[PDB]
């Protein structure tokens, strides 16, 4: 069908170890964001280019059986153009870039607090994966060689933040 432009949605879990803004440690997986989950909308225009716009955050504890007290990664938006290309009729290699905005409720040890606010450009990349022709997963990563605050600062994990998730396409108006 002439459905070249096709919308989709998805949801993620994520993890962010990050020293480079910290306090120095020896061992210690020091972290800015630590972890989170998220929800996204997106489209493609064929297997050529597309977009993805969504929120990665930490809803205090999304378990809801109680909540975190403060400093949690309350909310944000990431709004990105995307590139995915298949390497088999199974999975795609994936990358996206655009902008981000962020807030986190900075009730904490006064000075011993999180980054409370942000706005910046953003990117991620990794893979996107077919599960059945209307349902997918993706796994995406954002890295730099962090100036990781530690004992003997050569010694860093050199590992970026990562997230992984499911996706589902907008159905209807579609044919082989």
Swiss-Prot record:
The record places the following residue ranges in the Extracellular compartment, namely 17-33, 58-74, 100-120, 144-160
**TM segment ranges:** 6-16, 34-45, 49-57, 75-86, 91-99, 121-130, 135-143, 161-170
Where, in residue ranges, is this chain on the Periplasmic side? 1-5, 46-48, 87-90, 131-134
> Where this protein primarily resides, as one coarse class?
membrane
Positions of post-translational O3-poly(beta-hydroxybutyryl)serine modification: 163, 167
Q: Which GO terms describe its cellular component?
A: cell outer membrane; membrane; outer membrane; outer membrane protein complex; outer membrane-bounded periplasmic space; pore complex
Q: What is the effect of changing residue 108 to P?
A: Becomes sensitive to phages K3, K4, K5, K3h1, TuII*-26, Ox2h5, Ox2h20
Keywords, sorted A to Z:
Cell outer membrane, Conjugation, Disulfide bond, Host-virus interaction, Hydroxylation, Ion transport, Membrane, Porin, Repeat, Signal, Transmembrane, Transmembrane beta strand, Transport
Tell me the outcome of changing residue 93 to V.
In strain: K1 / E44
Q: Where in the cell is it found?
A: Cell outer membrane
The record's function comment reads:
With TolR probably plays a role in maintaining the position of the peptidoglycan cell wall in the periplasm. Plays a role in resistance to environmental stress, and a role in outer membrane functionality and cell shape. Non-covalently binds peptidoglycan. Acts as a porin with low permeability that allows slow penetration of small solutes. A very abundant protein, there can be up to 210,000 OmpA molecules per cell. Required for F plasmid cell conjugation; purified protein plus lipopolysaccharide (LPS) inhibits conjugation in a concentration-dependent manner. OmpA probably acts as the receptor on recipient cells. Required for the stabilization of mating aggregates during F plasmid conjugative transfer, may interact with F plasmid-encoded TraN, but not with TraN from plasmid R100-1. All 4 external, surface-exposed loops are required for F plasmid conjugation.
Provide the protein name. Answer: Outer membrane protein A
Natural source organism: Escherichia coli (strain K12)
Gene name as annotated:
ompA
